[PDB]
């Protein structure tokens, strides 16, 4: 059955940095448009916001199509979640990285695996490049989600 | 830099039943439909193919828009591959459950991870329920994907 809330695994799943795809429609083309990102935060049971660089081209699909789906692990399972009212947001926090934030109001959590089986394992993703200043620009990236 | 065929990594890591999310769209919602599936196989360096139940929703939505992404781990990425030209086939071996057998031509594969992080580990799927019958029944789909 599908919930329209977020259970407080699933909050507790999205509010610790995961690797989730946030899945955007572009009127241009005929498929959907993927990112995985680490770079949300749920805000409570109803609210999901997210960081992205300013400059992505998901600036003007969000605007012209105020609507987006993440799938996540939570539980032993994989969930979509699909949010519309989706609006940009400011801080007032010092920015680290030219990015824009974003808020949407959760419409509906779905459990999305196939019948009879179970995640053992979500996965796991390190830094290459730079690991000690990346992770803290995580940190910073998330206090300011979090604000 | 985005690909128009599979590496050898990701055809691997495509015929081993790897969990995957099919994305598809819908005119009728404003989101994309999305599930995760393992009946999934890259016949070459261009073609997927995969099985699905065939009373699925999703029987609808891709004759009506003939178009999917995939999105899945390889390397110690996550990619996604968008398919056009998706037709329903059919198989002259018997059928184990009722399925609708789907094949798509690939027109782009996209590294689409975040900048300075790689996966260590994939996401690893168990059977909860009726485990060597299930195990049993993947084979016999990898088989007729295959075929």
Not at 33 to 47: F, G, L, M, N, R
């Amino acid at each position: 059955k599908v919930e329209h809330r977020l259970s407080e695994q699933q909050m507790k799943a999205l509010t610790d940095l995961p690797l989730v795809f946030l899945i955007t429609h572009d009127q241009s083309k005929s498929w959907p448009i993927t990112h995985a990102i680490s770079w949300v935060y749920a805000k409570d049971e109803t609210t999901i916001r997210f960081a992205i660089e300013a400059d992505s081209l998901l600036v003007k699909t969000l605007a012209d199509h105020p609507v987006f789906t993440l799938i996540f692990f939570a539980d032993q399972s994989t969930y979509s979640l699909t949010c519309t009212d989706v609006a940009a947001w400011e801080t007032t926090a010092r920015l680290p990285l030219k990015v824009a934030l974003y808020e949407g109001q959760i419409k509906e959590v779905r459990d999305i695996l196939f019948y009879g089986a179970a995640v053992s394992d979500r996965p796991r993703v390190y830094k290459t490049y730079d690991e000690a200043a990346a992770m803290q620009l995580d940190q910073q990236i998330q206090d300011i989600l979090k604000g």
